[model samples]
Target chain A: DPTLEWFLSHCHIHKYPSKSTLIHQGEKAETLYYIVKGSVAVLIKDEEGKEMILFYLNQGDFIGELGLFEEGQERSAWVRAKTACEVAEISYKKFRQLIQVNPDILMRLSAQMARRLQVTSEKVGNLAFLDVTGRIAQTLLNLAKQPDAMTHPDGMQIKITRQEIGQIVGCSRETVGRILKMLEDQNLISAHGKTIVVYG
Target chain B: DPTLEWFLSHCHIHKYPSKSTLIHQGEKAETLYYIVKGSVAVLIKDEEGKEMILFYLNQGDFIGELGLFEEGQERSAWVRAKTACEVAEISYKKFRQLIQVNPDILMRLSAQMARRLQVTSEKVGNLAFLDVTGRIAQTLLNLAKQPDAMTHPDGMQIKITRQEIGQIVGCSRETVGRILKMLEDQNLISAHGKTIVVYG
Candidate 1:
């Protein structure tokens, strides 16, 4: 039912290895990636060149299409690969065709973006309301329910660095590290090496 | 071309005078509004139960349908009109029909939501990376650009209170007041009886 036939008329399948930069700041949106497998990272840098990890999107997710929806504006953020990822590539034309054929998918994706928007709005509110330690706790709480969240032998590993989390929450690497250490000390969770583990 | 033919076919129109609420919080998505004319303000409250103006939308813009694209989540926001408004009422069914029929419109609206997401993201980043003064200045700069931005006899007056602006930018009312005063003292702008004029 979710076959790529409608899109594959002009679409391609691209493979991105881990840590690959898939999209860059200031680039124009020309295509969309439907994640068949693996993970991607959404990151952005401020005017001061401070980079932050915004989202760690996994399978069944897509990227780069949001900017294209804005009519005519350059891509607003950066996207990268977090793990070996395979994406069903759909060009703008093919994407339009797919939408024409399957209106449900367009509605579905729009809804997904809307939820992401709500999460982003909450992040804004939390940054002002919560301290760095609270943010770290909240971030862990948010990630703990996700699919790729791994329970490493050492701890529950969230395939990102403390610095990346800091960037996502708009704090410094030092601040994130400090709060993470506090979180570790409180036994709210354990970080065996870079992996994170939460016990019952 | 975008006139609500499908809306007229499948739905009725709703008119509300100034200061009427169209959509309520915690409701389901049942109707959508295509702004024909007049002004409406969108408000959402935080955990503290204080209402904050998200945006004041006008003609050619629409409302009440964003969440429908996402499985119609429980409405988490409210829409209240600031001026007498005329809206082409579209039932959720009709809106779906229109979206299903017109890929161009669907694509355009999706892009608009994406743009909105970017603005929200930018707002989050600014709140975190910039201080009270900088954030206030940024908010005013954006407010000044809004088509609904007031052009009073004195100057471009933003009709919001210090408290509302504080809420919008996630700062204390006292801090916002101080920042406005600081900017005033610097001659970056002039304020007269709650009005601001760009000095340049």
Candidate 2:
């Protein structure tokens, strides 16, 4: 029954405002962080500094785990808080000490890693097999199929912006806007300002 | 001292020809297969049906592991042998029975899960930030660094198809082919027919 909070309680805590990076790609792997509050984006970059945010991590997520098992490896991605947040920080030395008494810690970390991998695999599959329309349709349909989906008279209402939709589908905001127009033309959705509704 | 082979030894043996599917995505989670020889690709498909191959698992790798930890979950991807191979197959019922005696089976599986998650996350991150050339460069560099990837003539020999690389990078087969066109043009690598030899 031990949770992330339980594991993090043994570590020192720190806080940072939004926009501050908690981890840098290519840096030496030395420590781990557990999100205590807020959200952060784990991202990758190329030279001339073009980075694409992969996904956002929320509370209860662990950063720096990629290096935990193989301590000799360097960081593979950048982690930066998108919102002001607090995090529990610990060094590999401290984590080793903590795990000596609780090897279940490793199991839990493994499970979390498994979950993240599952999510990323789904995204990769979606990108590779589905066109932007298919991807958008899948997302909208999934949202509309929820039990409480009939939140509005039009259909399943979602108060999400085009930018947010673009982020979710890994497309650009303008493309999402054009796609939304096409979906509307296809009579699959109804949109008014920021309130979008999907017809199931 | 127990390994995948040791555990698999307790199960029924099966052989499949190249292009034969061993596991179907969305099937009930009931069995697991441990490869004894040859290679298999894990892939995902959409209904129209566009399919994108993910990664290939060779000897010592286990297929259907994504469903092992969550026994009630459906298979998230398909597994098809790309080379004639032998595998060990055991129903979840038998696996549970075996784990009762060798509980370290869970730990080993967990560690393997962690390793796969690490590899997939690297691919997803690469797709997010790097161009096809950069992604291919990284994957090629990684393969070359492996001890067995060394070749007699040019130090490193790559015997993978553009289709195979698309499986890793989530790019189209044509996309990979065009990307390689630049690799040779820039004198970064050499390719002739089926074999690619990389220097450094």
The sequence of per-residue lDDT tens digits that candidate 1 reaches over residues A1-200 is 45545544555788999998878978877788788789988887776787766767888787887755644557767888889998887776667666777777777678778777767766666766666677778777667666887665644557667776777677788887777778778887777666666554
TM, every model: 0.85, 0.76
Residue range with the least summed lDDT across 10 consecutive positions in model 2 chain A:
A44-53
Docking class of 2: acceptable
Scored by lDDT, the top model is 2
What is the C-alpha lDDT profile of model 2 across B1-200, one tens digit per residue? 45665687778989999999998888887887888888888888766656676777888777776665554888878889888999988887777666666555655666567677767766665665566678888877776764447574765887778877776666788988888878989888887876777777
lDDT of 2 by residue, A1-200 (tens): 45455677778999989989999888988898888899998876555465556778988788887776655778877899989989999998888666565556765665677677678888787665556778877878766775665687766777777876665665677888999999999998988998778874
Error of 2 at B10 (Å): 4.9
Instruction: Please give the RMSD to the true structure for each candidate, in Å.
Output: 3.6, 4.3
| Backbone N/Cα/C clashes per model | 8, 0
Q: What TM-score does structure 2 among the candidates reach?
A: 0.76
What is the C-alpha lDDT profile of model 1 across B100-160, one tens digit per residue?
A: 6665666656766787678877776776678778888888878777786767554555656
